[PDB]
Design brief:
It is classed as chaperone. The protein is mostly helical. 74% of the residues lie in helices and 0% in strands. Helix 1 runs parallel beside helix 3 and helix 2 runs antiparallel to helix 3.
Amino acid sequence: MALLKANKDLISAGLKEFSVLLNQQVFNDPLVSEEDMVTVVEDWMNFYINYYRQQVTGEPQERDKALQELRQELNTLANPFLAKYRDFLK
């Protein structure tokens, strides 16, 4: 797996941020619909990616390769979240 120390070190920070942030969720009094929640997950990652991209380092392709993977992490991170909500409520 092609993952530099500094490159992977950046994604690791965001990876844990999503896990911890998700832990805050209680799932009991969610007023927001499942549809409106979808757009939130997308915008949520867009905000994080914009921050990290503003603090990268390496090479043109390296930074692009490291940031490109950030999507995979957040992409799947949604799998458990969506499965939980969909399983808990409609």
